[PDB]
Nucleic acid binder design. Sequence first.
RNA 1: UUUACUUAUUCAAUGAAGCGGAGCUGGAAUUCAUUUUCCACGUUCUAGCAUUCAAGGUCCCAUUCGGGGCUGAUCCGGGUU
RNA 2: GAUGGGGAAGCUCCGUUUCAAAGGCCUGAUUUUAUGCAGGCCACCAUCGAAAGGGAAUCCGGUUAAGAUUCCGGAACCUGG
Lengths: 233, 120, 67, 252, 49
Amino acid sequence: NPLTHSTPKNFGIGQAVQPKRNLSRYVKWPEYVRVQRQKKILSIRLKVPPTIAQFQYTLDRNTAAETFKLFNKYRPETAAEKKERLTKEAAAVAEGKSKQDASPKPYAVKYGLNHVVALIENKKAKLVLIANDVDPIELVVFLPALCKKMGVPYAIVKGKARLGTLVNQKTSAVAALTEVRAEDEAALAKLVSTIDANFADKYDEVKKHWGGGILGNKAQAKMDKRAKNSDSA
Amino acid sequence: ALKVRTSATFRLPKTLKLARAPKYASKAVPHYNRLDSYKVIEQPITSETAMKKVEDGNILVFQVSMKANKYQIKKAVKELYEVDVLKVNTLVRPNGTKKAYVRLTADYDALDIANRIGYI
Amino acid sequence: GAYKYLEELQRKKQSDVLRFLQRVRVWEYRQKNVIHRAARPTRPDKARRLGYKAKQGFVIYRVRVRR
Amino acid sequence: GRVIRNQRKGAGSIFTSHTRLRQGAAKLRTLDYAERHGYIRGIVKQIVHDSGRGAPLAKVVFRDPYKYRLREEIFIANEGVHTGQFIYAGKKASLNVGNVLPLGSVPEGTIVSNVEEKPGDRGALARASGNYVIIIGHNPDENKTRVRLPSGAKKVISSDARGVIGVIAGGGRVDKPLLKAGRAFHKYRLKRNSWPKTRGVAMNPVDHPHGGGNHQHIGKASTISRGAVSGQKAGLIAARRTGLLRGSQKTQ
Amino acid sequence: YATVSKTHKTVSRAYGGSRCANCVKERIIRAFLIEEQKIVKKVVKEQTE
RNA sequence: UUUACUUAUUCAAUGAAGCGGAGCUGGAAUUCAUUUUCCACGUUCUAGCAUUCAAGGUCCCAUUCGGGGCUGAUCCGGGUU
RNA sequence: GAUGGGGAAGCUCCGUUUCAAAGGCCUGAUUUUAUGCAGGCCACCAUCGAAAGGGAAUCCGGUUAAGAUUCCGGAACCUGG
Ligand SMILES: [K+]
Ligand SMILES: [Mg+2]
Ligand SMILES: [Mg+2]
Ligand SMILES: [Mg+2]
Ligand SMILES: [Mg+2]
Ligand SMILES: [Mg+2]
Ligand SMILES: [Mg+2]
Ligand SMILES: [Mg+2]
Ligand SMILES: [Mg+2]
Ligand SMILES: [Mg+2]
Ligand SMILES: [Mg+2]
Ligand SMILES: [Mg+2]
Ligand SMILES: [Mg+2]
Ligand SMILES: [Mg+2]
């Protein structure tokens, strides 16, 4: 205690060359990192036409959790399940001359963009989930309007990766329920009511609101200062 | 995302460099020794000057492979003739072949070695 | 399917949505290399019409040429 | 029908600068946090001759604020700057000869040198020996400083641009007659291959617009339009006037 | 200099074969006086407030 | 025609290091004393020195070695300027 | 004069550290193997370019028809280990 002493460093300008500080704000990031960040920035700095930026409204966390909880009860067959079904079907129809009906009618989430679009056009879909992060957005921009025209309840949900985990893929970009079981029919009706309250009933209003137009941090501060000076005086 | 990274320079992250595990051999037969003793030492040089060197200076004069260096010449002389080599001097002759003056240690008589290997 | 909607929408190049996408994508392409591999077709319907298939062995490259 | 000498100079084959013996580019410190907000002290270690340059250079050593090491900078020495002198550079440095200050931080009438045209350019204006820039006023709103350049031109510069207090050393250099083709030879030997100059009127027509004729004469007006093309711009390019200048300069 | 012992390349002092004796002495005096002046400047700043 | 904005485009620099907005403190104008405002914000007799996650303080563990976190070095926005 | 990049229909041109994720050598620990992970330090950069520039270190005597600071005898020096 008497041998050690306090020697505070003067980290001001011109003394005691600066200590190591968190410079992550100033990191010269790789070109791909800078490009993806600046693309995300530009997509909101520009004025986003109302057909886009309807995807900035995603299902809230609780309704999304309920939706994926319901959809997880209708996962499509895996490789092992399909192999087991194929064995239990072939080895049964061969012995008993069955009409390939040794398996029950399947209830699975419908996925695939073309398949789901055709189901929407044929009014088979009872609940369509559209991923909010389809990188070429033209694939799903018409989907809210197609669902609205065909009277199909649709929800813009966060995660094509989440829909992929729903359908045993990496990504699915869509997920649809056309037929639901009796024990989940009431849950489907309540979920569809909430989803229509959030997306389908608001479509005619969100169709007239342009997105984006959001300034950066420093431009926002500058405009706040100029409004505080010129406007409030 | 929330790490400190006290430097503003971003360098390429270190990643695993697996060693090669080929599904087939590249050559399928290792080449035999391209420079063994029998072609490192091509033949003795038997000019009058070379024979005088053999008789007097305890120096064997050989024509050697143009690819062979002093280590290879010394090793080949030691293996082929069972003699320790004191020193190897090499030159490229005007005719494009390599000449080696191999001075053996004092324990060996280059004249006796030459007589043993057939040239006197 | 959705490829027909893609085909029809791609013909409205001066619509608000396609103009916004054009601006953003042209900026991103100008930021990337003059010639660079594209992970997937920007217009999958056009790629299919031109013979592309989403299988191994099919490659998309984006290229910038001076006008 | 031949490419003229001033056209050939642009290729830079034998007309490049002879930079072997030069001490390095003469620049102010990089405009960093220390100069933007406070000041930084360096030490003049050497005042050295620069080949091809009239003005002497000052080697000023500063401490690196972010790493333990020394940073040597090559300033253009102002008159009165001496070795062992402490140079202060930044927004908060004092008004002393050799100090580097933002133009806005100096009073009107201040004499500066090595003045930046833009902040952080490390010095563009009044760099030749004996030359200097006069601060004539500030515009604190939309911060700008009005300066008079060595040519007499009035310029509006950002108030963050820096300059070195004082006049560039080596003044009065051009007052001494060179007195000798040999002295002009040794002058330009360490700058560039621009000397000696053959008169275009002493050439043949193929070599120059002024060439040819049974007497040496231009033949047409030596005043050449600004819109003329390469190979034509020989003589007095875009001359507003000609002849011996009489009266006062600084038209306004 | 790689083939001679350390005794040939240095001098028994604070800067050996790098600085001369007079320059080393001047460095000592400057360091001591400037640190003393730093102490007196600190106390002057403390007693002027 | 004149003006604004910035993300297109353009110019420049840096090992993209301290940018922008608040806050603390230091003398100041007054408040409807809520709140409103300005400036500064660890360095200037001297050709010295300034680097080891900086000592110190505090907390945890783990012991014959010590290691780690916070603070020292205010908070937020990740727009390098 | 490659690379990264940009231009050019193209042969190729520019540019040489430039708008690049450009790196291996020190070692605690790893020693399920002194290694990848993982404590902790450093790069504004390929390469070519001088038999007169820079540069580690050899001299004497003798010896051949023709080699000599190279061989022989003696006596040293430098580099790496
Ligand atoms: K003429
Ligand atoms: Mg030889
Ligand atoms: Mg693929
Ligand atoms: Mg003349
Ligand atoms: Mg002349
Ligand atoms: Mg003539
Ligand atoms: Mg002519
Ligand atoms: Mg003419
Ligand atoms: Mg004549
Ligand atoms: Mg080239
Ligand atoms: Mg070389
Ligand atoms: Mg030499
Ligand atoms: Mg001779
Ligand atoms: Mg010898």
